[PDB]
Amino acid sequence: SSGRIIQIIGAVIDVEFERTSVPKIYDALQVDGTETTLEVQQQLGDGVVRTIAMGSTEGLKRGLTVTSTNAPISVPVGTATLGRIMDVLGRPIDEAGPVATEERLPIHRQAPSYAEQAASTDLLETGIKVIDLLCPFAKGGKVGLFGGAGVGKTVNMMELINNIAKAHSGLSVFAGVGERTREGNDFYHEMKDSNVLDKVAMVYGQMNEPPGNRLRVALTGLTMAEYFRDEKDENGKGRDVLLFVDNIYRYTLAGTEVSALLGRMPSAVGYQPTLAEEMGVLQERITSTKSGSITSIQAVYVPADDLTDPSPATTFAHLDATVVLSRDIASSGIYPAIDPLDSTSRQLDPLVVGQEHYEIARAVQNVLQRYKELKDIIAILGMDELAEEDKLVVYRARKIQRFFSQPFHVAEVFTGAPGKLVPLKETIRGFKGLLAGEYDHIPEQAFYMVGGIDEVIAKAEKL
Amino acid sequence: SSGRIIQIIGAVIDVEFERTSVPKIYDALQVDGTETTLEVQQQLGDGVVRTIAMGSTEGLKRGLTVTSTNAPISVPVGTATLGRIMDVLGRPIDEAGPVATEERLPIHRQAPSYAEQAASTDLLETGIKVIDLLCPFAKGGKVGLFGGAGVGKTVNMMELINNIAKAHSGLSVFAGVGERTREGNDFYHEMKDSNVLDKVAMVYGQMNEPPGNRLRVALTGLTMAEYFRDEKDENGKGRDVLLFVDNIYRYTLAGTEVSALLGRMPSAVGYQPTLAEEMGVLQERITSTKSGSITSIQAVYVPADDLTDPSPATTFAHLDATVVLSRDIASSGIYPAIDPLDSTSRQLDPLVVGQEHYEIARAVQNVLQRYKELKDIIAILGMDELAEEDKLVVYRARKIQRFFSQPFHVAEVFTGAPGKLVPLKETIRGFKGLLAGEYDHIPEQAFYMVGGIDEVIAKAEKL
Amino acid sequence: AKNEGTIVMVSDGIVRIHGLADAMYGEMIEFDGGLFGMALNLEQDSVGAVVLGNYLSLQEGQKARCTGRVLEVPVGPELLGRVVDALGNPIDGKGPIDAKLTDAVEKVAPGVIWRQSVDQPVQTGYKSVDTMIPVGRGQRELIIGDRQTGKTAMAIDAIIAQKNSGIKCVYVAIGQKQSTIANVVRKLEETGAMAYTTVVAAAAADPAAMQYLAPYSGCTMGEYFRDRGEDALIIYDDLSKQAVAYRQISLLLRRPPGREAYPGDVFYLHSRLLERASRVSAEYVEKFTNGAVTGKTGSLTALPIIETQAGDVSAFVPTNVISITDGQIFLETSLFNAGIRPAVNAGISVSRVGGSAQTKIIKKLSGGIRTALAQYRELAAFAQFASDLDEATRKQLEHGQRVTELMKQKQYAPYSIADQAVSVYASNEGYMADVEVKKIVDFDAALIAYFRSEYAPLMKQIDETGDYNKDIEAAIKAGIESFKATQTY
Amino acid sequence: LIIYDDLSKQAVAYRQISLLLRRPPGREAYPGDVFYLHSRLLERASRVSAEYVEKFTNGAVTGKTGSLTALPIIETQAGDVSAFVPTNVISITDGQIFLETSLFNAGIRPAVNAGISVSRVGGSAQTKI
Ligand SMILES: Nc1ncnc2c1ncn2[C@@H]1O[C@H](COP(=O)(O)OP(=O)(O)OP(=O)(O)O)[C@@H](O)[C@H]1O
Ligand SMILES: Nc1ncnc2c1ncn2[C@@H]1O[C@H](COP(=O)(O)OP(=O)(O)O)[C@@H](O)[C@H]1O
Ligand SMILES: [Mg+2]
Ligand SMILES: [Mg+2]
Numbered sequence A, B: 001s002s003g004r005i006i007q008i009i010g011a012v013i014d015v016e017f018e019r020t021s022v023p024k025i026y027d028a029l030q031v032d033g034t035e036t037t038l039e040v041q042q043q044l045g046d047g048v049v050r051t052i053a054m055g056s057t058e059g060l061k062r063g064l065t066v067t068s069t070n071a072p073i074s075v076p077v078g079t080a081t082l083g084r085i086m087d088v089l090g091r092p093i094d095e096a097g098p099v100a101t102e103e104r105l106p107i108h109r110q111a112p113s114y115a116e117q118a119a120s121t122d123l124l125e126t127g128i129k130v131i132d133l134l135c136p137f138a139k140g141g142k143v144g145l146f147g148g149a150g151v152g153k154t155v156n157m158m159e160l161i162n163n164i165a166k167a168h169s170g171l172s173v174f175a176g177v178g179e180r181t182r183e184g185n186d187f188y189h190e191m192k193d194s195n196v197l198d199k200v201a202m203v204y205g206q207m208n209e210p211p212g213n214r215l216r217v218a219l220t221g222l223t224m225a226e227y228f229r230d231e232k233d234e235n236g237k238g239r240d241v242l243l244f245v246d247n248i249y250r251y252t253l254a255g256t257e258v259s260a261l262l263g264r265m266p267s268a269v270g271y272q273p274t275l276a277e278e279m280g281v282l283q284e285r286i287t288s289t290k291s292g293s294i295t296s297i298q299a300v301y302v303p304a305d306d307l308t309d310p311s312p313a314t315t316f317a318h319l320d321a322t323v324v325l326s327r328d329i330a331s332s333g334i335y336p337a338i339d340p341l342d343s344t345s346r347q348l349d350p351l352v353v354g355q356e357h358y359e360i361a362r363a364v365q366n367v368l369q370r371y372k373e374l375k376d377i378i379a380i381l382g383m384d385e386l387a388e389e390d391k392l393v394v395y396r397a398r399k400i401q402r403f404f405s406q407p408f409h410v411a412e413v414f415t416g417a418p419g420k421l422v423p424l425k426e427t428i429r430g431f432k433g434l435l436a437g438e439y440d441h442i443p444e445q446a447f448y449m450v451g452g453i454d455e456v457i458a459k460a461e462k463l
Numbered sequence C: 001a002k003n004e005g006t007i008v009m010v011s012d013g014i015v016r017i018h019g020l021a022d023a024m025y026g027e028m029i030e031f032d033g034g035l036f037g038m039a040l041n042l043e044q045d046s047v048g049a050v051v052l053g054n055y056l057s058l059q060e061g062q063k064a065r066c067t068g069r070v071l072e073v074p075v076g077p078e079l080l081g082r083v084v085d086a087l088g089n090p091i092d093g094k095g096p097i098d099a100k101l102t103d104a105v106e107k108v109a110p111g112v113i114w115r116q117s118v119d120q121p122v123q124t125g126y127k128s129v130d131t132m133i134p135v136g137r138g139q140r141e142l143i144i145g146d147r148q149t150g151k152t153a154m155a156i157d158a159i160i161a162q163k164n165s166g167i168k169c170v171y172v173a174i175g176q177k178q179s180t181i182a183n184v185v186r187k188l189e190e191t192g193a194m195a196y197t198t199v200v201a202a203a204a205a206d207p208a209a210m211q212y213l214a215p216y217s218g219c220t221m222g223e224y225f226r227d228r229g230e231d232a233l234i235i236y237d238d239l240s241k242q243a244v245a246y247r248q249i250s251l252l253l254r255r256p257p258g259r260e261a262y263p264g265d266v267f268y269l270h271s272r273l274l275e276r277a278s279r280v281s282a283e284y285v286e287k288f289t290n291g292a293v294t295g296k297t298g299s300l301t302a303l304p305i306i307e308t309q310a311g312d313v314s315a316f317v318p319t320n321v322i323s324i325t326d327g328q329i330f331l332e333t334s335l336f337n338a339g340i341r342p343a344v345n346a347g348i349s350v351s352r353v354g355g356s357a358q359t360k361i362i363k364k365l366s367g368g369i370r371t372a373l374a375q376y377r378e379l380a381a382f383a384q385f386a387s388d389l390d391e392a393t394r395k396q397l398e399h400g401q402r403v404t405e406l407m408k409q410k411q412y413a414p415y416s417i418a419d420q421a422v423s424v425y426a427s428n429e430g431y432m433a434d435v436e437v438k439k440i441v442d443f444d445a446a447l448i449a450y451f452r453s454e455y456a457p458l459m460k461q462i463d464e465t466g467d468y469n470k471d472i473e474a475a476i477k478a479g480i481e482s483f484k485a486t487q488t489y
Numbered sequence D: 001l002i003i004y005d006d007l008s009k010q011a012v013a014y015r016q017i018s019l020l021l022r023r024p025p026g027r028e029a030y031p032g033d034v035f036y037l038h039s040r041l042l043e044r045a046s047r048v049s050a051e052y053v054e055k056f057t058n059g060a061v062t063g064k065t066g067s068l069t070a071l072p073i074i075e076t077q078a079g080d081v082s083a084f085v086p087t088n089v090i091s092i093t094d095g096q097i098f099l100e101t102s103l104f105n106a107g108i109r110p111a112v113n114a115g116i117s118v119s120r121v122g123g124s125a126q127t128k129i
Helices: A129-134 A153-168 A187-192 A217-230 A251-261 A327-332 A355-381 A388-403 A409-415 A424-436 A453-462 B129-134 B153-165 B181-193 B211-215 B217-230 B248-262 B275-283 B310-318 B327-331 B356-371 B375-380 B388-403 B424-435 B453-462 C127-132 C151-161 C178-190 C208-226 C239-252 C266-274 C282-289 C316-322 C360-365 C370-383 C391-406 C417-429 C440-453 C456-464 C470-484 D008-020 D034-042 D050-056 D084-090
Strands: A003-009 A012-016 A028-031 A037-043 A048-053 A065-068 A074-076 A104-106 A142-146 A172-177 A200-205 A240-245 A293-300 A321-324 B002-009 B012-016 B029-031 B037-043 B048-054 B065-068 B074-076 B104-106 B142-147 B173-175 B200-203 B242-245 B295-301 B321-324 C009-011 C014-017 C027-031 C035-042 C047-052 C064-070 C072-075 C082-084 C101-104 C142-145 C168-174 C197-202 C232-236 C301-307 C327-331
Touching: A074 A217, A104 A217, A129 A355, A129 A424, A153 A172, A153 A187, A153 A240, A153 A293, A153 A409, A172 A217, A187 A200, A200 A217, A217 A240, A217 A293, A251 A293, A251 D034, A251 D084, A355 A388, A355 A424, A388 A424, A424 A453, B002 C035, B012 B248, B048 B211, B074 B217, B104 B217, B129 B356, B129 B424, B142 B153, B142 B310, B153 B242, B153 B295, B173 B217, B200 B217, B211 B217, B211 B248, B217 B242, B217 B248, B217 B275, B248 B275, B248 B295, B248 B310, B248 C266, B275 B310, B295 B310, B356 B388, B356 B424, B388 B424, B424 B453, C014 C035, C047 C208, C072 C208, C101 C208, C127 C360, C127 C417, C142 C151, C142 C316, C151 C178, C151 C232, C151 C301, C168 C178, C168 C208, C168 C239, C178 C197, C197 C208, C208 C232, C208 C239, C208 C266, C239 C266, C239 C301, C239 C316, C266 C316, C301 C316, C360 C417, C370 C391, C391 C417, C391 C440, C417 C440, C417 C456, C417 C470, C440 C456, C440 C470, C456 C470, D008 D034, D034 D084
Parallel strands: A142 A293, A142 A321, A172 A200, A172 A240, A240 A293, B142 B295, B142 B321, B173 B200, B173 B242, B242 B295, C082 C197, C142 C301, C142 C327, C168 C197, C168 C232, C232 C301
Antiparallel strands: A003 A012, A003 A065, A012 A048, A028 A037, A028 A065, A037 A048, A037 C009, A074 A104, B002 B012, B002 B065, B012 B048, B029 B037, B029 B065, B037 B048, B074 B104, C009 C014, C014 C047, C027 C035, C027 C064, C035 C047, C072 C101
8 A cells, every 4th residue: 555666767756556556647645754745657567657756855765655645736726825926736935824725626637628619719908009909819829928038028927917907807827937037026026016916826946846846837827727717706707817837947948848838848757758648738728718718928038039930930839929029129118128020920810800900900010111121221311311201101100119118007106107008999099090190290209108099199288 | 380470560570480390581471361471581590580471461460370382472474474464472453364374483583693794785765855865775774763752753754665665576575663553554554555565564563552562562573574585486585575663762661661670770861771782682683694685764762852862872883874853953844854964874985876976965064064153153243244155155054954855745734735756866966056056046945845956946936 | 368458558648458369450449438449569478559538547457358340430421511539429519420331440442453544623713723733533632831821721712612513521630729620610610611521620639549540530431422423522631740649659659760750651651541542433333332323433532731841842751741642732931921822832833633634624725834934933033143134035024923923812712613714814815914013913803803794604604514615715805805995993 | 256167067077977877868969957957056146135144043143145146157169159058058147248269369358248248137236436
């Protein structure tokens, strides 16, 4: 009824068992005399199972006793996890006391069937108006921030965190393993001071912990997001949830880590990987059912300055939208600093969103592209010599690029500005009006940090 | 004696015999209760021989008995195989009843000695423009076509069959062509209505057969060619039978597919360890002895479209005239797509072809090679920059590249233009006139699929 | 004991079974809990097997039994307008399917004597394919390109176009996400093309064994009509995923690895499937039907899809698949992002059947236009460096530009035979020479609309009969000349 | 303040031990765990709070914050930062100092390229002056 450790090689721990009681795949076992828990991965015959240690490893010796829980690893999930930080097993680490939630779920579950898929393709609306018009997201999609370390990516995550609550009353989950660069306060404090802390649940893990801890974190985040989505209100409907799975440091590692979101190990099981069956369900677990929709935002690095096709593109296979952070525009100070041209989305099509949005969104990219191509000749020889036909193009491009800037509610406690949450239809109306040229008389500086069009005209009249 | 099956993986089957009745190499065996036969490939001691099954291994299990024939796979050879189509073991598959022939020969036999090797002395016209000039043929020789998938090897093979075989009398030709069934079924039908099926024998295997059948197709055809040439009618000869194989590569592909299962370690690119000898033992038997003659044409596949692959590189040494097809020329519209450079024939000697032919060929190759090196200069600096002595070379190279094109009798279904035939003297006269600087005013668009020079003149007039 | 057995090893969907001495190659096995396997590796003292379905409820020491039958799927005419998985179990929840027959999944193709040449056309609605790279009933052809190059758009458009023809169609999805499959099914149902289509779905959330056996079951379902004198058409969403699944299965099962980290018999894997598409002869139909039907010739068409990395065609696998089929259609990213849609490369795409798989009018018209396009492309590439040109080169260049613009078409807008004939006749005769390089896309649409509003009996005659009599060409010329004058865009 | 004279040589030594331990070579120049070998080391340099200092010291020290700074050195071949090891350490550090060789041979010493050498915490550490 009790086993013994047989072979400790790296993270792989082969454990034998009695003949009539051998743990089924994915079962969890507890090692007496130490803090560590084992997860079953594959069976090897002769009553021997190959497992991976989950807790921190210390002073392990051959032949240690082990007792079986007979059930998968269950993580506490509920409403009390909001504003807390937990271990990979759900044990809190923020010194704030135990989590009072009493219900838990297994972290290894099956995919929703073909009969549980949604009957349409809806667009998730966020507060940010650059992202919404140019790179629309999709409820159940997969997002990639292709952003380098220098730009302020975190404030974008915070703005999403705040707006989903307000926009759709949907909770969020954050999971990440370690930190790549330190240029500002650690996320926890940077979220505490902005008061978005109670709308999110956080799972974290270092690198000096065993490779088991580094793995199986996205699964815990996914289980929490699933519980948030499935919970129903008095109207008998679910919520829309965002899963912020942090990149694992570098993309070389993210090659495995991107594929870790696709269920691939970074050489944890060097003999016989077990991913085809574990992986590939991970890509599915993220979907929009009729009741609730869950979406995934993942950050990645672009050191070569090469993204998409220039980049390895292995990420490009499954990503539905790519958000690009530009250092030049950030130097400009237009925050959020998102490139309006390089960022792309597959949901920008005449069928999914309609012909109106497609016609409006496609036109602004053309004007931006033309302005970017003539900026050099404008620089060398000046604006005056340029024909008036292109001068209108330049003026309109400046207006839209200024309008892309937006006050953020998460930074209100610092700047003091009232902040804005611009609905999508109003963004469409304002962009169509600007493209047609009704706002031509409107002077500049009425779009920088001015939020919504009516606020544009209010700013114009107030000065 | 009788053995039993002890292991089966795909095609490779090893049968364990008694202590003293172990069958020799290549001693075909019959499996009782099934239409399958086995051939010995290698010995493993202990009374175990690892064999390959001829036919599907579905429907069989471990434990079945086998009877040793103690003789290689013998095929029927004689005058009665003429006009019949048969599978590799020699079973007729034309629904025309059995074959009345008692003479039978084994398909595994040694190679002719050094003493009985005969020279080749007589040319052999084919009607193609590029082949008759840059690569003359000779009776009793060996010819090969080198190409990547989709570049026209077959069409050229069918044109050669239609252009020499149908005219030469008493040929007693042999067909070992193996290709997409659709192409095969059409051949048998085409040959029949033309009433030339009387003096032709055929052996055909498809692509869907297991590796057992695909491995030994060519040996059967070689045996049927060897019998015919050797025989002598009273006061007569062997009929100078001609062999055409369109399936040479599959021999090596099946070899490398089963080599790993026979235990052989990987070599080079991963091709089998014994590539060279395996290719040699087959490519040697296609020769002309002092007792007869054989004229053969082969098709050589080029994997991944590189000629440095170990499979096509080994075959260069085994041929007299080599024809190389390039993908780029095919994509440019020029047919047939033969690389004027990298194509040579042993019979291109001033003593064999003559004096004028040699000078014409050398001048053509020199002009093309000179043009091959002027592309980068034209790119970086204008065309105008290069001297006139190179303008002439560029224009003559373009004209020569199109003039080596002609329409075929066989390939009229694709283009819809009538076929053409050109004798050697017309080719020589036209190229002599071209290199001389005459026909320098005719636009290069009149040299395309126009065949003979007077047709060039007429086509240029029509424009 | 010969049928009983145990389990000694479970990992990643592979179960290795002791005993089972009486076990054939490919014969199914029964697991505890309604789970079926497939014996693929037979050894000295063990049997390999792949599990069909979820294997997480299998442990060591369980039992297994041999059915004594090969893997088979339900097949019939009642499967039309339904969605099933790789074993034929319905998933759309529209009630059970009334099956009457079962067919083996692993079967050999018809022999050489029992086949026939292919002389009947198959329409697609695309000008490029129907005029430059023809397809016919019984021909196998491939769609090759990168990711996000519109490869699947061409496959569905073809399925929709087979409305009045009477060809049953099949669709197989391998490795796709559930949302995409649902969207495709919705699009099929909306257009009314689901009344004859059957869909087999083995999604990414399914075991590699399911993603490996999907095309075989699709072909077995499609052969029902071929063996009885009725045409059929089958589409494989992506065979690259099947290759990956096979490499997985053959590596988890101990088999020596090979070139490119791929295993042996991948060529055999992709060839034993495609060769099952054939056009049988009337004698074969009569013998199979036992005299029930006479004077009918069956057929079966295939359109497998393969994706490539970095847009190369000289890769080992793409060429291994090109060497099997009777053609290929190549889609280029550089043409896609440049606005040329559908992006088809004329030079590298060929058809091996040729004019045999065409109507009389199209074959008489669409002659020598693909080679002209390739020659134009090379001439333009060279002439970008040439300082000066003459009349002939300029004429060829203009014709090439106009033709490359005429071949662009929208999605979900299938042209008919009359439309293609009129467009190609107008192009060849030279009425598009004076028109600007731009506004060509408007020209063909406006001309088709005019020729549909008027001259309707001529189009009816051309649609029903493919004949091209002098009267037809005279009428087309007179109509195009009438449209040229006294008529504006 | 800790300085590692060369970290690429540590990677080479780790590769030698791994290859002598009969582990598979893989398709890359170095094994895949070199990344974690460097990350587990560079993660241990950080500033702690005053409360942690008091907690660890049992109240002996109060109102003082600990610290630790790392200045590892990485060797490149012909200025190739696209190799395996150089790109693993660039992406887990808060700054880079790029010393060229063309400037070094041209007399400009120290040779620091300001165009590509950046800092992340810069402007906070500097004194007011
Ligand atoms: N004729 C067309 N005109 C314009 N856009 C088109 C056309 N055909 C396809 N597209 C675009 O391309 C998309 C189709 O891409 P496709 O299905 O080839 O992607 P994929 O991911 O490579 O395919 P698969 O589904 O096999 O994985 C359409 O959604 C549309 O955006
Ligand atoms: N003389 C020719 N005229 C026109 N087209 C040709 C000619 N030769 C080859 N082709 C084209 O090249 C392709 C080559 O096909 P085939 O030779 O059967 O395959 P492979 O080159 O692999 O043997 C054919 O589909 C045909 O369209
Ligand atoms: Mg070929
Ligand atoms: Mg797709």
